[PDB]
Ligand binder design. Structure first.
Ligand SMILES: NCc1nc2ccccc2[nH]1
Lengths: 245, 179
């Protein structure tokens, strides 16, 4: 997470991020819409940060410092590079829409009027197919990853010291290994709530209301597909047990 | 400071997201109430014991039966929520949420929490519910449901005014520490 984006999203809301003289130029309904869009982008920035802690802090530290077998590290952090690729691209598109909307002479005053089209693009076509494939794989490997982590923490001294060392800083308080895995699993089910609330305050332009209505439907289709493609993998569960899920 | 994990379950309109937000900030937001809650690790000292209590929401997972149980592994205490302004949310507790939590979290204490207690004597709430032949949940109806489901205890709170919020999480911490 770079300083520029952290500072742009430091405030608890859009209404506290923009200059108060700029805030006063907008209707109440536009303020409400912008506050929810700001929450979507700020939580996406945090989710991309969670994925960077998993790839750079945990995964790479285990490979370079503990010299763990790539297969063990893969079991602990399944699909992390694919997940990071999906969300860093989506975050880049969100931040570019904000950057283009900035008033000349300002690095904080903006209004995003056309989010719907960006959401339709993210949740349709090849990007939706990749999100569905990646989350169906990740969520099916969730239980296996937590069990593999617990076994390593309890039986390997160097692994326990590594974890305690890299998770000691206060900035990592909410981001232990298991915490990162659940943060990532829960991310996809936050989108409908955020989109529906943005839609609630986007009736001013009929085309925007229609675009968000389509986007909400696409996110729900994606979640139903992922939910239907999940089966918890279990190391040691013989094929005789797969049949009764 | 031992680490304990708390998960809140309940219907979409039970107020679980707001309860987590108000507790974690010790404040009902004055400018913007967030739509979602990511996670939080609260430092709580209850009866002389210091605990790091990790908090998790299940909001948005209600329609996904294979995604939702991924929130449950290693849970130490469950907050099972209903809204006092919604007798329908209380009816869904014994045969939807309770058998699910007992399956994925066997032997984990469950605290039944009646949220939005400030709406029990709200005239707009009472007029609205009377159209569907209903009324705000009474404290004894909450206690009887908690007794029926084998809850560890029954508690009420209001995220709006903060009354009872600290008590709910301090009791959850005590329940998470028990054998
Ligand atoms: N006071 C700022 C504010 N109020 C809101 C109500 C609903 C949605 C967003 C909102 N932002």
């Amino acid at each position: 997470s770079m300083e520029m984006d952290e500072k742009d999203f430091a405030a608890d809301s859009w209404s506290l991020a923009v200059d108060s003289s700029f805030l006063q130029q907008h209707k109440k309904e536009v303020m409400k819409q912008q506050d929810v869009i700001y929450e979507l982008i700020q939580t996406e920035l945090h989710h991309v940060r969670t994925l960077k802690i998993m790839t750079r802090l945990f995964r790479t530290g285990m490979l370079e410092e503990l010299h763990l077998e790539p297969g063990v590290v893969q079991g602990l952090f399944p699909c992390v590079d694919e997940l990071s690729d999906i969300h860093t691209r989506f975050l880049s598109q969100l931040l570019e829409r904000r950057r283009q909307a900035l008033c000349p002479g300002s690095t904080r005053n903006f209004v995003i009027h056309r989010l719907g089209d960006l959401l339709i693009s993210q949740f349709s076509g090849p990007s939706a197919e990749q999100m569905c494939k990646t989350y169906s794989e990740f969520c099916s490997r969730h239980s296996k990853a937590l069990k593999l982590y617990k076994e390593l923490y309890a039986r390997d001294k160097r692994f326990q010291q590594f974890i305690r060392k890299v998770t000691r800083p206060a900035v990592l308080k909410r981001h232990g290994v298991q915490e990162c895995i659940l943060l990532v699993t829960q991310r996809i089910t936050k989108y409908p709530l955020l989109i529906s609330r943005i839609l609630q305050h986007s009736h001013g332009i009929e085309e925007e209301r229609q675009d968000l209505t389509t986007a909400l439907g696409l996110v729900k289709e994606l979640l139903s597909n992922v939910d239907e493609g999940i089966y918890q993998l279990e190391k040691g569960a013989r094929l005789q047990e797969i049949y009764n899920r | 400071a031992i680490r304990k994990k708390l998960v809140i379950v309940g219907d979409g309109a039970c107020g679980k997201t707001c309860l987590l937000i108000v507790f974690s900030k010790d404040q009902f937001p004055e400018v913007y109430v967030p739509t979602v809650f990511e996670n939080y690790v609260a430092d709580i000292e209850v009866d002389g014991k210091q605990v790091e209590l990790a908090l998790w929401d299940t909001a948005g997972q209600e329609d996904y039966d294979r995604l939702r149980p991924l929130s449950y592994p290693d849970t130490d205490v469950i907050l099972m929520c209903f809204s006092i302004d919604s007798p329908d949310s209380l009816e869904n507790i014994p045969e939807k949420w309770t058998p699910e939590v007992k399956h994925f979290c066997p032997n984990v204490p469950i605290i039944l929490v009646g949220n939005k207690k400030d709406l029990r004597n709200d005239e707009h709430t009472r007029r609205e519910l009377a159209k569907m032949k209903q009324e705000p949940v009474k404290p004894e109806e909450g206690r009887d449901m908690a007794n029926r489901i084998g809850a560890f205890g029954y508690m009420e709170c209001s995220a709006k005014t903060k009354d009872g919020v600290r008590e709910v999480f301090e009791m959850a911490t005590r329940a998470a520490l028990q054998a």
